[PDB]
Design an enzyme around this catalytic site. Sequence first.
Site, PDB file in Angstrom:
ATOM      1  N   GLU A  35       1.077   6.314 -54.282  1.00  0.00           N
ATOM      2  CA  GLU A  35      -0.094   6.763 -55.270  1.00  0.00           C
ATOM      3  C   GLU A  35       0.165   6.199 -56.583  1.00  0.00           C
ATOM      4  O   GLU A  35      -0.616   5.346 -57.227  1.00  0.00           O
ATOM      5  CB  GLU A  35      -0.399   8.237 -55.421  1.00  0.00           C
ATOM      6  CG  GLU A  35      -1.052   8.895 -54.095  1.00  0.00           C
ATOM      7  CD  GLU A  35      -2.406   8.393 -53.711  1.00  0.00           C
ATOM      8  OE1 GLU A  35      -2.935   7.780 -54.814  1.00  0.00           O
ATOM      9  OE2 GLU A  35      -2.924   8.271 -52.478  1.00  0.00           O
ATOM     10  N   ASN A  46     -12.073   3.973 -61.034  1.00  0.00           N
ATOM     11  CA  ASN A  46     -12.821   3.860 -59.532  1.00  0.00           C
ATOM     12  C   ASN A  46     -14.363   3.316 -59.825  1.00  0.00           C
ATOM     13  O   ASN A  46     -14.991   3.451 -60.934  1.00  0.00           O
ATOM     14  CB  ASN A  46     -12.943   4.822 -58.832  1.00  0.00           C
ATOM     15  CG  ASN A  46     -11.376   5.348 -58.522  1.00  0.00           C
ATOM     16  OD1 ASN A  46     -11.230   6.599 -58.757  1.00  0.00           O
ATOM     17  ND2 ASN A  46     -10.688   4.390 -57.917  1.00  0.00           N
ATOM     18  N   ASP A  48     -17.084   4.516 -58.772  1.00  0.00           N
ATOM     19  CA  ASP A  48     -18.064   5.626 -58.947  1.00  0.00           C
ATOM     20  C   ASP A  48     -17.980   6.191 -60.459  1.00  0.00           C
ATOM     21  O   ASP A  48     -18.364   7.352 -60.434  1.00  0.00           O
ATOM     22  CB  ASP A  48     -17.779   6.472 -57.957  1.00  0.00           C
ATOM     23  CG  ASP A  48     -16.581   7.442 -57.836  1.00  0.00           C
ATOM     24  OD1 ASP A  48     -15.454   6.972 -58.713  1.00  0.00           O
ATOM     25  OD2 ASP A  48     -16.296   8.291 -57.231  1.00  0.00           O
ATOM     26  N   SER A  50     -15.394   7.452 -61.592  1.00  0.00           N
ATOM     27  CA  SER A  50     -14.393   8.448 -61.653  1.00  0.00           C
ATOM     28  C   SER A  50     -12.925   7.866 -62.086  1.00  0.00           C
ATOM     29  O   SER A  50     -12.744   6.612 -62.069  1.00  0.00           O
ATOM     30  CB  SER A  50     -14.273   9.405 -60.219  1.00  0.00           C
ATOM     31  OG  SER A  50     -13.829   8.419 -59.266  1.00  0.00           O
ATOM     32  N   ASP A  52      -8.441   8.143 -61.167  1.00  0.00           N
ATOM     33  CA  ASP A  52      -7.380   9.033 -60.778  1.00  0.00           C
ATOM     34  C   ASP A  52      -6.368   8.854 -61.729  1.00  0.00           C
ATOM     35  O   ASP A  52      -5.962   8.150 -62.422  1.00  0.00           O
ATOM     36  CB  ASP A  52      -6.654   7.929 -59.576  1.00  0.00           C
ATOM     37  CG  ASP A  52      -7.803   7.732 -58.529  1.00  0.00           C
ATOM     38  OD1 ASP A  52      -8.296   8.575 -58.078  1.00  0.00           O
ATOM     39  OD2 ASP A  52      -7.709   6.663 -58.004  1.00  0.00           O
ATOM     40  N   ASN A  59      -8.219  12.765 -58.391  1.00  0.00           N
ATOM     41  CA  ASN A  59      -9.413  12.058 -58.748  1.00  0.00           C
ATOM     42  C   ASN A  59     -10.395  13.050 -59.450  1.00  0.00           C
ATOM     43  O   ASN A  59     -10.515  14.010 -59.401  1.00  0.00           O
ATOM     44  CB  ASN A  59     -10.090  11.452 -57.684  1.00  0.00           C
ATOM     45  CG  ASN A  59     -11.339  10.564 -57.966  1.00  0.00           C
ATOM     46  OD1 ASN A  59     -12.166  11.206 -57.874  1.00  0.00           O
ATOM     47  ND2 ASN A  59     -11.027   9.372 -58.329  1.00  0.00           N
ATOM     48  N   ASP A 101      -7.553  22.580 -49.082  1.00  0.00           N
ATOM     49  CA  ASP A 101      -9.057  22.568 -49.198  1.00  0.00           C
ATOM     50  C   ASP A 101      -9.485  22.087 -47.681  1.00  0.00           C
ATOM     51  O   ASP A 101     -10.770  22.278 -47.337  1.00  0.00           O
ATOM     52  CB  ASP A 101      -9.626  21.607 -50.127  1.00  0.00           C
ATOM     53  CG  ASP A 101     -10.933  21.991 -50.566  1.00  0.00           C
ATOM     54  OD1 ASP A 101     -11.162  23.094 -51.202  1.00  0.00           O
ATOM     55  OD2 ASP A 101     -12.052  21.014 -50.198  1.00  0.00           O
TER      56      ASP A 101
END
Length: 129
Positions: A35, A46, A48, A50, A52, A59, A101
Amino acid sequence: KVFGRCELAAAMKRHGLDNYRGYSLGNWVCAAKFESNFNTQATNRNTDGSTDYGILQINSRWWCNDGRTPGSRNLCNIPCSALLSSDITASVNCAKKIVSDGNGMNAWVAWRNRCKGTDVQAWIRGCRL
Ligand SMILES: NC(=[NH2+])NCCC[C@H](N)C(=O)O
Ligand SMILES: NC(=[NH2+])NCCC[C@H](N)C(=O)O
Ligand SMILES: [Cl-]
Ligand SMILES: [Cl-]
Ligand SMILES: [Cl-]
Ligand SMILES: [Cl-]
Ligand SMILES: [Cl-]
Ligand SMILES: [Cl-]
Ligand SMILES: [Cl-]
Ligand SMILES: [Cl-]
């Protein structure tokens, strides 16, 4: 701060990630490697809008609030800037929520592509924890 492999293994063990939600410590160390390259300060933008953040590249669309991401949910209830500390506490606490989650460590794309399927125990080998 950039962690060394065994230094990060030690810290993640301290924070209770060894076997968290059934994932052995080597999974978490491998995930951080691919990562962020063990880099607590890394960020990645990113398409969109967003971003990280941090050693586990958490994110901003779902997990943390950075005040600049559309459709944000802040499920970890934390500002993204807190994930850029050289202390991994906030990232681990968020990671524990992400992995709980319901999709496990598949949340981390680098883990899914470059760690899952390999012998992850090798990531803590020789660390004598
Ligand atoms: N499989 C390996 N030995 N990888 C290299 C990691 C070494 C790590 N940065 C350390 O000093 O602990
Ligand atoms: N990253 C992957 N898709 N790996 C698939 C095969 C991996 C192989 N079984 C290994 O021991 O590492
Ligand atoms: Cl780096
Ligand atoms: Cl922020
Ligand atoms: Cl936002
Ligand atoms: Cl730390
Ligand atoms: Cl926290
Ligand atoms: Cl990837
Ligand atoms: Cl392991
Ligand atoms: Cl161990």
